[PDB]
Amino acid sequence: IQELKNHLHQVLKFSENSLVRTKQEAEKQQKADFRASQARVAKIQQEILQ
Amino acid sequence: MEPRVMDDDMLKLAVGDQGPQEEAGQLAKQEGILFKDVLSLQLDFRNILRIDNLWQFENLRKLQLDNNIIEKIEGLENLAHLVWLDLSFNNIETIEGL
């Protein structure tokens, strides 16, 4: 009973934290991509200005 | 089964399968509905989960997304010329993204 309860805990952690960590790489790569995009938007904007 | 998420590949797949047409008619449709200038999109009965990859469809006017499992309305920011929209038979609980 005790080892199966710990198995419930471990694999609930697997499911919940695995899909939250997929959301985490989604957050990290979305921040990197959008920040690079808006930086390029900025540089092209001063090119527009000059 | 797995609800796949909606992208440009099945968008052009639906553009392909909506009209069989002929060869000169197919060239006419190539000149008529470009990826920028698709007049109408029909994506029904695919089990659509999340609306995405509609940036290229700038001149889209009619969009059909019925009989699916879309839960949140999003990704319609670039359909400024959209006139007809079908989001029926979905899992939408809150109206947003319009």
Add this chain to the structure above:
Amino acid sequence: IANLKDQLQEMKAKSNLENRYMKTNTELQIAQTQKKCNRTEELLVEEIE
């Protein structure tokens, strides 16, 4: 014990389900921040044109 074994495999089934479910959301979410990138750069190319 048979219950605990039963919820394990049931949650593993729902875990696989929501795994491919919003894992495919996250990958095409990377593709949607990428479509934001490419749309912004194409709009910039259009306005400098």
Add this chain to the structure above:
Amino acid sequence: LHDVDFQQLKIENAQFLETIEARNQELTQLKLSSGNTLQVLNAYKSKLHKAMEI
């Protein structure tokens, strides 16, 4: 139209026949050697069992 080859190759095949006959000759020589061994086996065996009953 004319053009035959294999009559001339019977010179090589007659060399093959001579090789066959000579090969039979040397294998008969080693047959004689193996036979000489077989007679000395039966001679040695004869001497040894007669020496056993003595």
Add this chain to the structure above:
Amino acid sequence: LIDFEQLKIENQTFNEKIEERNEELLKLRSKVTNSVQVITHVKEKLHFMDM
């Protein structure tokens, strides 16, 4: 084409001489190897016998 077949009639017979004469080779070599093995065995036997 005649005389090569004329020789080939007895080339087959010499090809039978290839078969049966070379077949005896391994048999007699096995016989003589086992024979000399028997020689050495019975020679040690006859030494102990002579003592």
Add this chain to the structure above:
Amino acid sequence: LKALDNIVTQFNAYEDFLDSQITTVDLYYLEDETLARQLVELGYRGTGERVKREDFEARKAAIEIADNFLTALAMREEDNRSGKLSSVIFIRDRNSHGQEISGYIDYAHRLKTEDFEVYFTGKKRLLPRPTDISFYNWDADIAVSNSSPNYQVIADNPEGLLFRYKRDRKIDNSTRITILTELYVQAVIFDHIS
């Protein structure tokens, strides 16, 4: 055997191999995985290769693993382990059926194949074998020859025996010792010094 050992090495367990043979339809039918594995025993309900689970334990264990006569053989064995000798044995005795038997035994090769402390203690007996390099049952009258790498039977010789060892091509320093034994009628030791 090679294919089954290959699959044993490919999968960490036949738990995992039969899990791979388990499709999802059995998973949501049975709602168990170990019970599914016991169902996917054989092609009975799967694509599992013919390897039992206990046979897999045995196979992965195997992969993980991978009288003056006794005194005379003891010194010959110590010289063989020192590696400066290759030695052979002449045995004259009778078997359990009672026929008179003469054997020429590759002692060092037989040492390398199996341990001989049992032979020294007497629980096993050095007997002439067809797997030995020369075997001769006097009533059977059949000479059995083996081409061991320790000693090679010749293709043909008229005069005397020529047994070859691969390192020294001696078909050199052979000492002959005949000793009286109780279990065996006659025992002779030939020692070819390396």
